C-alpha cells in the first residue's frame, strides 16, 4: 500500500545547471508549502529529487467547497475527485487558488511530471475480477470512475457498450457468411442499420452516464492551456497566425497521401505479380500487404509524432480545442494508413485494373481478392496491435526501512502517461473496419468481438502495470471521436454498398449508392425519433421538481353601472328576459 | 378608444334551451369574480350577452409575480404579457391558480370566443407607419411583440428576414435569366447554397430573438389542452388508441394522393391536347392548369378542414403536440396540392411522356414547357391568394365590439404555411423560371403589409402566446431545402438533355450537405449569447508505525530545504 502520498513530482536535476536547479527546487518547495501541501523530499534514480506531496484538512475542505460551488456555477452540479482537486491546486496559477508549478510554462522547468501513485492492492483485485468474469456490470465502471477518473471510465464504458453491440453484427455476419454468400446487399443494409443504432444508443448511454456521474456540462467549461503562448492581453493570439500555421496541414496531408498511396500501389502491384507468376504451395500472395500492416504501427507512429509537432506550433488557448485538433489530425492519419489499401483494392483495382499494367511491367482481375485482403486487414493488424500493446511490454519489463516503497516509486516514474486517445483511436478504427469493409469478409466483426473481450482486460492491464496512473479528468462526452464515429458510419453506408455492386459483377452503382445513403439517413432519423420517444432525464426532472417545491368621463362611468354581484346578476337576468 | 376593457366574454344565449343558460351565466360570473376580475354585462348581437372583464391591482401583481417565479423555475427567465396573464387567469382551472371557464371542456359551453379588444389608434398608426416605409427596423417587430404577443412577432420577424434574404435569389435569378439561358446548373447550386444560408441564419436569428424577448425555452413548458379526454388518472390516455387513430391518416393520405393525382393527370392531358390541337392566335395552352391553381384554395381548403377533424378525434395531451400534428398534416396536404402538378410535369411527363397517350386518345415532347408552367405556378397562385386575403352614451364602442366578435380568430399557421410553400417553390422549382424569386420578392413586400392589415381590421386580436421559435416549420423548411437541392439538379439534367441524372443528384445532394456543415460551422464560429454569458458572469459574482514516521522525518519547510540541499550535494 502507499504511504499516504497523494501526488508525486519528479524534479530531475542534471549534473550541470545545478546553480539554478537549487533555486528552482527551493521555489517549488516554497510554493507547495504556501498552497498548503505537506512535502517530503527523497533521492531518486539518475540524480533526481523525488518530492511527495499530500494535504491541513480544513484547506482541502475549503478547496472542495470552492470547486463544488464552481461546478454549481456552470450547471454541472471519492479518490478521483480528491486527486483532481489536489492536481488543480498544484497546477493552477496564483491568480485562482493555486501555485502554478507546471513544467512547460513558467521557470519551474526542471520538473518532468506530476503524477499520483498506483494502488497495487486495488489493481490486482481489479485485474482478477475482470479476468474471472464474462461480462462487466455497471458497478465495475463505477469503480473505475471512482478510482481513475471520468475519462478512463468513459473509455471503458464505451468499450463495453461497443463489445456488447458487436454481438448483433457478428451474429448476422456469421449468418450471411454461412448462407447468404459473398457480398450480400442485405448484410450491408443490416451493417448500416446496426452502425446507426449503436451510435445513437451510445449517445443516449453517454448522456445517462454523464448525468449519473455528475459530469453533465464539463465540456462547456473552458480550461486554459499552461503552455499557450500569447502576444497581447485585453491572453489573446492573432487568429491570422493560427490560420497560417493550420494551412501547413494541407501540404502535409497531401504529402502523406502521396507517400502512402505510392507505397500501397507498389505493394499491391508486387502482390499481384507474385500471385500471377509464382505458384507457391495461396498464402504467400498476400505476404507483401501483411508486411505493410506490420509496418503500419511504425511509419504511422512517426507520423503521429509529426502531428504532435504540427500541434505544437499551432497555438491553442483551451485544452479542449487543442485535444480536438490533435484527435482530428490523428484520426485523419490513421484513417489513411489503415483504409487506403482497402479503398485502392475496392475502388481502383476492381473497377478499372487496367492502370497498374506499367507497374506489373516494372517487376518483370479476381473479384474475390477484396474478401481475402479484408480478412488479412482484420486479423493481422489486431495481432500486431496485441503484440505492440500487451506482450512487447511484457518482454520489456522481463528484461528489467522504507526501501520497497521508494523503489516502487522510482520504477513507477519511468513509465509513460496513459494516453486514452490511442485506445479510442484503435476502437474507432475497428468500428470503421466493421462499418465500411466487413461486407467483403462478414466474419470480421466476429473476430473483432473476441478481440474486444481481450481488450477490455488487456487495456485494463495496460493501466495496471504497463503505465503510470493518469491524472483524473472530467469529460461529459468521449469528445470529437463521436463525430469520427458518425463519419465512419455515413461513408460506410456508401462504401459497403459500392463493394456489393462492384464485386458481384455504371448506373447501377450510383443507384445502389443512392439507395444505401438514403436508407442510412432514413434509419438515422427513425432511430433518433425512437430514442427521443424513450433514467437520467427522469432524475433531472425529479431534481427540478424538488428544487421547485423547495423554492416556496365615459370610462369612469362605464364600470360603475353594475359594480356589485347582485346588480350584475339582476341586469343579466333582466336582459335575458328582455330577449 | 377602449373603456379599460381587458377581455370580452361572448356567452351567446339561445332562445331554445334557456333553462340551463341562466345557471351557466351565473356560474360564469361567480367564477370570474372569484378569480378577481371586475365584470360588466352588456347587450350582444343575435341573442347574446357580452360581459367585459378587467382587473384589484394587488391580485394582478400577485399573479404577475407568480408567473415570473414560474418562468424563473423552468429556466426561461407590456400589454401582451398582461393580456396573456389575464387569459391564463380566465382559462386555468381553479385547482391551480385560476377559474376554468374554457369554452370546450366543461359544461360552460355557451361561450364561443375568448378575445380581447383591438386598439384602433394603434392599428391605424401601425398601418400608416408600415405603408410609408421601405424597410422595417427591429423597433417595429419589438412593438409587434409588445402589442400582439410573441407568436405574431415571430411570424413577422420571419417574414421580414426571409423577404430580406430573398433579394439574392432575385439578383442571381435575374442574372441567370439574362445570361445563363435556361436550366443553369450554377443557378441550382446558388439556390441550394442560399437555402442553406437562409435556414441557418434564421435559426441564429430565432435564438437571438428568443434571448432578447425573454422567451428562450418556452417550448420546453408543456401546456395541457382543455379539450384533452382521458380515461384514467395516475390524466392518462391509452397510447394504443392514439396510434389506432393516427393510422387513419395513411388511407386518407393515399386517397388524397390518388384523387389529386388523377385531377392533375387529366388537366395535364387536356392542356397537352389543346396545345397539340388548338391553333389560337399561345396563352390558352396553360388555361387548364391556371384554373387548377384557381381551384387550389378551395379543395385544399376543405382538405385542411378534414385534417383538423382528423386532429380532433386524434386526442392530444399537450398543446405543442396537437399543434405539431396539425402543422404536419397541413404541410403534407399543401405540399401535395401545390407541388405535385409540377412534379408530374418535371419527373413524369418530361422523362417519359409516352404514358399520357391513352388520356390524349380519350380526349380525342416540349422540354421548355415546364418553365412556362413554373411561370403559371408563380404569378397566379399569389394573385388569387391576394383575392383570398384582402380583396375578399356608449353606443359606438358597443357597436364596435359587436362588429368585432363576428370576425374570425387570427391563425398564424396559415401565413406560416403560405410562406413555407413560397420558400419551397423557390428552393425546388425556381430553376425552371429563375425570375420567380423576383416576383416572390415583390409579393413579400406586399405581404408584410397585407398580412398586417389582415390583423388590423379583418380579424380579431389574437391571444398573446409566447413561443420559443416558429415551431415545427423549421423541419418543413429543412425538408424543402433538401428536396430542392435534389429537384433542381434533376430538373436541370432532365431539361438540358440515365446515368448522368444519378451523378448530378449525388453531386447536388452532397454539395448541399457539405455547405450545410460549412455554414453551421461558420455560424458556430460567429449577440444574445454574449448577453447570456454576461448575465451568467454577474450571477457568478453575486453568488459568492512507519506510515506516520514517513512524514515526520521533515516536519517543517526549512528542514525539508536543508535535506533537499544535502541530497543535492550527495549526487
Ligand atoms: Ca488491442
Ligand atoms: Ca487498446
Ligand atoms: Ca398572400
Ligand atoms: Ca399571408
PDB file of C-alpha atoms in Angstrom, chain B residues 5 27 48 54 58 63-64 98 109-110 173 194 203 225 232 293 324 447 468 526:
ATOM      1  CA  UNK B   5     -61.792  46.524 -21.050  1.00  0.00           C
ATOM      2  CA  UNK B  27     -71.702  30.286 -12.648  1.00  0.00           C
ATOM      3  CA  UNK B  48     -76.082  37.157 -26.778  1.00  0.00           C
ATOM      4  CA  UNK B  54     -60.893  43.795 -16.321  1.00  0.00           C
ATOM      5  CA  UNK B  58     -52.937  43.646  -5.858  1.00  0.00           C
ATOM      6  CA  UNK B  63     -50.391  36.760 -10.440  1.00  0.00           C
ATOM      7  CA  UNK B  64     -47.579  38.573 -12.273  1.00  0.00           C
ATOM      8  CA  UNK B  98     -57.417  30.417 -11.900  1.00  0.00           C
ATOM      9  CA  UNK B 109     -70.022  25.520 -23.386  1.00  0.00           C
ATOM     10  CA  UNK B 110     -72.267  28.534 -24.044  1.00  0.00           C
ATOM     11  CA  UNK B 173     -32.142  34.685 -60.811  1.00  0.00           C
ATOM     12  CA  UNK B 194     -28.923  30.344 -50.406  1.00  0.00           C
ATOM     13  CA  UNK B 203     -32.106  29.703 -36.777  1.00  0.00           C
ATOM     14  CA  UNK B 225     -55.160  21.072 -23.627  1.00  0.00           C
ATOM     15  CA  UNK B 232     -57.809   7.008 -16.133  1.00  0.00           C
ATOM     16  CA  UNK B 293     -54.493  26.986 -59.429  1.00  0.00           C
ATOM     17  CA  UNK B 324     -47.200  19.908 -34.397  1.00  0.00           C
ATOM     18  CA  UNK B 447     -47.431  40.555 -47.705  1.00  0.00           C
ATOM     19  CA  UNK B 468     -39.576  29.927 -28.427  1.00  0.00           C
ATOM     20  CA  UNK B 526     -19.519  33.613 -35.144  1.00  0.00           C
TER      21      UNK B 526
END
